[PDB]
Design a protein around this ligand. Structure first.
Ligand SMILES: Nc1ncnc2c1ncn2[C@@H]1O[C@H](COP(=O)(O)OP(=O)(O)O)[C@@H](O)[C@H]1O
Ligand SMILES: Nc1ncnc2c1ncn2[C@@H]1O[C@H](COP(=O)(O)OP(=O)(O)O)[C@@H](O)[C@H]1O
Ligand SMILES: Nc1ncnc2c1ncn2[C@@H]1O[C@H](COP(=O)(O)OP(=O)(O)O)[C@@H](O)[C@H]1O
Ligand SMILES: [Mg+2]
Ligand SMILES: [Mg+2]
Ligand SMILES: [Mg+2]
Lengths: 50, 427, 49, 446, 439
């Protein structure tokens, strides 16, 4: 029972877990993008209304 | 344990250095073909180009479909795959080219993730507009919901004290049963009481399911999963498959591009395989030129065991492999060689082993000689009747006399043709 | 993944659990895409009418 | 945007020309075809002018000589706002639609119409929403305070607007725009104002939006539609669904003539603008004589976009007949069309195109490898080398060298067959394949 | 401001007493054909005798389509005119003969007259009770009032109209127009009288109508019997079962029976006898008729002896060809001889160098272009040498080339370069026969 192991591990628990880690990294980068946009808006408003 | 002409092919058996051995992966010979097939395997694994065309051509009994199955198996299940036969293109509900495009859009996969929100608990009260009250093992919440699923619950004969399961995203409604807290109310009640669920009524989960573009297109054009009366009442009105406008494909492409750009999905190219493409019409053949020279069309592989033939749909042009030069120019050709005696013997013994049959060496020599005499497929077909004939005499092995008896019992192509030529009334 | 003091802990979890805790089969449901083709096409037809 | 891995024409970018309509020897991803490029630029200028309609142009030449490349180049140089429909010959033979009906639908597809609708839209960040019940004094109570970057004011309900706002669960403090001419709430995003309380939305609203200040704004909306969309919308109760599903089913002609008259009225009134789109048909030699006859009349109408055709064969039998007409087309169409000819390429041009493909496909080509590839291309065909270049990469980093060399090209050439070599092998091995008469020699021995 | 080989033909250019000059209506040459076709226009305008056919024959690029367009222009925008090609007769939804019958009915139109009295803010509304029976509740009467502009007036009506206006969802203070014929009323909108009722609203301001409380207007409608019978056959309505079914039915046209034709003929006959309706016979045009088939031709004969057959005109350019569908029948213009016996033939002739040159002058003038005398003279040279249409199409690229070097007029070398750039049929087939690389 050997070939089925390699036909099943191509997309198994670890591959799906690593893909979920990829999407987590992506959404964390999106949160970083939101944070930098918000802080830049704060800096702009610190001089456009003070 | 069903076995049918395949399942002994466990892969190309190619080395990581791109040099194929002699006997491996249930394969013998065809070193050049296997090497080229592995090269194409890495080509598709690159997932960078699109609309590439490869045709492999060779005589019968040369494992062309075996090679296609081998590359499909080597790629694995992550990549989409869809085997096809040329005759399957012709339909009566939609034009042939539209079916070709439909199979094009089913040959590329998309891996997507989304959050599933559900609410499950005990039925407490039903206040019309619609507000519902749910009781969990420890929690309890009241939910306001659309009257559509309220009417669905009414259709679902949900009683008081029951436990239900709701999918918030799709509005899916399903009743688990009734709580065992109020269970032995009747001596022989038909309803099957079920225990109370454990956990909060509100629950969030994650999925990683995969879909193809054709699935998205048909889902957008044809909704076929409704629950309320209006939904299936509408969807039963047009059962016939219709055409799909190209603008729908462009809109779907835009939305999937947005999804992958945002970063919650990625695109997976795939392989489309058409077997016995010699019989395809001229119109489809000239349509392939436009279809391939696109941006999203996946790689395609064709098979044709022909020679100097006229392609179907015309009566003048004689082209190799039944493919006109216009499609040949955008095509890569792989040559398959006929086998020989020792490879035939190895194939026969391997097929016997995968059929868990015991065979004596002289019987293998007789089988190889006969296979060279007539064909490999003939011996492959008739080996199992030899096994049963031996089994009748309560012998687990194969003897030459048994093989000769089976060959006497069952005919081949040449003997049948010779009998037909000298026949009373076209026997 | 140099550390291995618990590298057998997942093996023990695998043996005892029988993947009914690592990942259970869910209630399968289709995709719930919501953008719709006619999201930005009612304005044009309304103006035309 | 425009998701795509790699296309056979991903390198051509809107032709290449000067202001004097002179093609540069190498511009925007293609080389050669000077006279054809100049003719294509002439046709492009015709389309830009928009004062001419119903002109037929046909591109002819040997296969694999910049025909579809020229079509893609003119399509890209045309740019947006000008409709462009590329259609193959075999896409019209449908069992649901008559061939002439499909050709009519394509022609109506390639006609651009610009419209301008004026609506009084009011936007701005809100603070809360006031929705009251019916009482003795009047219908309801409502006083919306709306804030912006510059100045913040207050407005009142309109009876129907309570129902409109209660249709959706509108959260207090979002940027929503109202067009009183329509009353459609456009919840673009939440109120920016101060992001200290709005720093952890968890994605959502796409970084909201900074309020623009002034609220009373009337901005014109430019909408581009084609005749097909209008007639399909008019045809059925819900024509948009038919448009998105393709079940139009032989739209009636009187609708079309009424649409023509009414859009002419709009053009005279200044409400509408007409854009002369382009219809392109490939391998038109696969068309039927009925289609050619219908085209012969449909061309002369005023609502006839410029139509470009490309074929490959020459002196062939037109489908539906038994006489080998010149160019594979009816003679009258040849009389009514203008022929553009493309000539064979040169070794320098083929090597430049191969290098363009190499840099396009992230392929690093050694000079000797380029020479060998050019030799193979000139020996057999452009596309053979244009595919061998991509295939040899896998061999290149199967030996762990990123840059391709001569040995990889030799291996690819010896691994994948050419049409001439394949036909030679097939002819020398005729008994091994299936004959045209079904004669097969499966048996190696006897 | 755009043209496509036409729209410079303004009528037929036939004077009184049936005479055609040289240059008129954007038309030159072929005087006798224009005379004959003007006679045909006179016959159609007689509106006395219908059921004729006329086929005109000639070579390519002769002006047959131009002749038909001149006919249509001369007739005017009142009589219907249905251009068509042979191919459109074929369909995948109904029979060829049937589609021919819809086109046949579409050719002839009818002008109908009818007067309507309509009543047009709303002052008030009030219903008036004991049903004296088993009914639950009702109103004996309903009294309403309309403001309008030319004075107001109250109105007493039946609770049916009250129900209808309630279904229209109209405010008490609003502008309303009510149809006296059947009682159908729609919400005109929020009248201008109650402007800025609140700070923000969405209803249209609908300025109050300027006119009497009740207004009578005369309506003249021009429709064809083809609209009539399809309107009769197609069902209508709202929520009734067949109404939703037809709303979802994808209403493909299918084989209109002759019973509707008989019924509509009877009704329009009694209406024209009453004197309210007037029938206007039309003309139907079939261009390039050689693409038809034997079945269409035989049913065309049968329909040609019909009662309400409009005058039809046919176009072809074929010679001693074999009509499609069969192979043993060699007939002129690919039209079966029995059909040929049933109509007249109008001959057309090829132009000369002078006529082609005049065509080029007219075509250059209409598109607001300047052509040098020598350039025009040479344009006529390969107009005669190759074809009229080639030189006609060549003009626009020449204008573009003139635009390149900033010169409004067109010069000799510009058109020479244009000819070099774009090939004609003869040169193209010369290249095709010379080469052997599949071209
Ligand atoms: N190298 C091999 N190993 C195992 N089986 C093979 C091999 N080559 C050919 N075969 C067998 O030969 C048969 C022919 O395969 P297929 O391509 O489907 O038919 P054909 O070769 O006639 O087109 C297959 O059933 C396959 O099992
Ligand atoms: N001027 C050019 N520059 C770059 N590539 C070209 C050029 N002309 C042709 N090609 C190549 O040829 C292919 C197009 O072939 P094409 O001439 O359209 O075939 P056909 O003649 O059958 O229409 C494209 O993949 C493109 O890479
Ligand atoms: N006497 C004329 N005056 C103006 N234009 C003409 C004249 N004769 C022919 N034409 C031109 O010829 C075209 C019509 O060609 P036509 O004779 O209908 O072709 P066919 O003979 O194939 O039907 C029109 O575009 C028209 O501009
Ligand atoms: Mg096979
Ligand atoms: Mg091409
Ligand atoms: Mg004509």
């Amino acid at each position: 029972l050997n070939d089925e192991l390699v036909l099943h591990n191509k997309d198994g628990f670890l591959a799906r877990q690593e893909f979920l880690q990829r999407v987590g990294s992506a959404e964390d980068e999106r949160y970083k993008e939101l944070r930098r946009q918000q802080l830049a808006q704060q800096l702009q408003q610190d001089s456009e209304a003070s | 344990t069903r076995t049918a002409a395949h399942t002994h092919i466990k892969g190309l058996g190619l080395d990581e250095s791109g040099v194929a051995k002699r006997v491996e992966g249930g394969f013998v010979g065809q070193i050049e073909a296997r090497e080229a097939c592995g090269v194409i395997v890495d080509l598709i694994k690159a997932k960078k180009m699109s609309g590439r065309a490869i045709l492999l051509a060779g005589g019968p009994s040369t494992g062309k479909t075996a090679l296609a199955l081998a590359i499909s198996q080597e790629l694995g299940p992550k990549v989409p795959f869809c085997p096809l036969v040329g005759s399957e293109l012709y339909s009566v509900e939609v034009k042939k080219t539209e079916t070709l495009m439909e199979n094009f859009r089913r040959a590329i996969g998309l891996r997507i993730k989304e959050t599933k929100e559900v609410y499950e608990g005990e039925v407490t009260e039903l206040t019309p507009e619609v507000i519902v009250g749910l009781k969990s093992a420890k929690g309890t919440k009241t939910l306001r919901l659309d009257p559509t699923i309220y009417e669905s619950i009414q259709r679902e004969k949900v009683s008081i004290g029951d436990v239900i399961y709701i999918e918030a995203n799709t509005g899916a409604v399903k009743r688990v049963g009734r709580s065992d807290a109020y269970a032995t109310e009747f001596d022989l009640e038909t309803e099957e009481y079920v225990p109370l669920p454990k956990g909060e009524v509100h629950k969030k989960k994650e999925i990683v399911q995969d879909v193809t573009l054709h699935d998205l297109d048909v889902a957008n054009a044809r909704p076929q999963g409704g629950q309320d009366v209006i939904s299936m009442m509408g969807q039963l009105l047009k059962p016939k498959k219709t055409e799909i406008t190209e603008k729908l494909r462009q809109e779907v492409n835009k939305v999937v591009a947005k999804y992958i750009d945002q970063g919650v999905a990625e695109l997976i190219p795939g392989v489309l395989f058409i077997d016995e493409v010699n019989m395809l019409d001229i119109e489809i053949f000239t349509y392939l030129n436009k279809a391939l020279e696109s941006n999203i069309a996946p790689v395609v592989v064709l098979a044709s065991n022909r020679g100097m033939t006229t392609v179907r749909g015309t009566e003048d042009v004689i082209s190799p492999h039944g493919v006109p030069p216009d499609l040949i120019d955008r095509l890569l050709i792989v040559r398959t060689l006929p086998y020989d005696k020792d490879e035939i013997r190895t194939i026969i013994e391997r097929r016997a082993t995968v059929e868990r049959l015991q065979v004596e060496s002289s019987a293998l020599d007789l089988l190889a000689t006969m296979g060279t005499e007539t064909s490999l497929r003939y011996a492959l077909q008739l080996l199992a009747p030899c096994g049963i004939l031996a089994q009748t005499s309560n012998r687990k092995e194969i003897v030459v006399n048994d093989v000769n008896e089976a060959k006497l019992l069952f005919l081949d192509a040449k003997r049948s043709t010779k009998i037909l030529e000298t026949s009373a009334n076209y026997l | 993944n140099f550390m291995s003091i618990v590298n057998c802990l997942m093996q023990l979890r695998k043996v005892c659990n029988h993947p009914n805790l690592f990942e259970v089969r869910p209630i399968l449901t289709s995709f719930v895409l919501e953008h719709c083709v006619a999201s930005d096409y009612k304005d044009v037809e309304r103006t035309l009418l | 945007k425009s998701l795509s891995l790699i296309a056979a024409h991903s390198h051509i970018t809107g032709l290449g020309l000067d202001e004097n309509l002179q093609p540069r020897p190498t511009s925007e991803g293609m080389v050669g075809q000077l006279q054809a490029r100049r003719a294509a630029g002439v046709i492009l200028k015709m389309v830009q002018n928009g004062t001419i309609a119903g002109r037929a142009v046909l591109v002819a030449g040997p296969p694999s000589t910049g025909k579809t490349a020229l079509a893609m180049g003119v399509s890209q140089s045309l740019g947006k706002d000008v409709p462009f429909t590329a259609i193959a010959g075999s896409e019209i033979f449908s069992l649901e639609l008559s061939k002439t009906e499909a050709l009519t639908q394509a022609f109506r597809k390639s006609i651009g119409i610009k419209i301008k609708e004026e609506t009084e839209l009011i936007e701005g960040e809100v603070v809360e929403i006031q929705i009251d019940r019916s009482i003795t004094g009047g219908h309801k109570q409502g006083k919306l305070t709306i804030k912006t970057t510059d100045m913040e004011t207050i407005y009142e309900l309109g009876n129907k607007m309570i129902d409109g706002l209660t249709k959706e669960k509108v959260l207090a403090g979002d940027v929503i725009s109202i067009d009183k001419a329509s009353g459609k709430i456009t919840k673009l995003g939440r109120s920016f104002a101060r992001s200290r309380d709005y720093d952890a939305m968890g994605a959502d609203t796409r970084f909201v939006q900074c309020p623009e200040g002034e609220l009373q704004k009337r901005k014109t909306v430019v909408h581009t539609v084609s005749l097909h969309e209008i007639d399909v919308i008019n045809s059925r109760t819900q024509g948009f669904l038919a448009l998105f599903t393709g079940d139009t089913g032989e739209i009636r002609s009187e609708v079309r003539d009424q649409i023509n008259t009414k859009v002419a009225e709009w053009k005279e009134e200044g409400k509408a603008e007409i854009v002369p789109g382009v219809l392109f048909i490939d391998e038109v030699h696969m068309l039927d004589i009925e289609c050619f006859s219908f085209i012969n009349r449909a061309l002369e109408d005023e609502f006839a976009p410029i139509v470009m055709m490309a074929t490959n064969r020459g002196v062939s039998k037109t489908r539906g007949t038994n006489y080998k007409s010149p160019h594979g087309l009816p003679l009258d169409l040849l009389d009514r069309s203008i022929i553009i000819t493309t000539k064979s390429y040169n070794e320098q041009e083929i090597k430049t195109i191969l290098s363009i493909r190499a840099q396009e496909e992230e392929v690093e080509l050694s000079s000797d490898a380029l020479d060998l590839l050019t030799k193979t291309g000139v020996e057999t065909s452009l596309r053979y080398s244009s595919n061998l270049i991509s295939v040899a990469q896998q061999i290149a980093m199967k030996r762990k060298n990123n840059t391709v060399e001569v040995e990889d090209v030799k291996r690819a050439y010896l691994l994948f067959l050419d049409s001439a070599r394949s036909v030679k092998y097939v002819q020398e091995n005729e008994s091994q394949y299936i004959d045209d008469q079904g004669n097969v020699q499966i048996s190696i021995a006897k």
